[PDB]
Design a protein around this ligand. Structure first.
Ligand SMILES: [Zn+2]
Length: 46
């Protein structure tokens, strides 16, 4: 694995969906726009 630690690193925003941490809101939002998912046309996967 990895330590994923480079000097400073404050996690002001935390995604209550997976566990991601962004520096600002905009950064968090853009991501939250990936979780959305329903009525999938093609369950072939899973
Ligand atoms: Zn997330």
């Amino acid at each position: 694995g990895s330590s994923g630690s480079s000097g400073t690193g404050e996690k002001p925003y935390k995604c209550n969906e997976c566990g991601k941490a962004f520096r600002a809101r905009s950064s968090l939002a853009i991501h939250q726009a990936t979780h959305s998912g329903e009525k999938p046309s093609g369950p072939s996967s899973g």
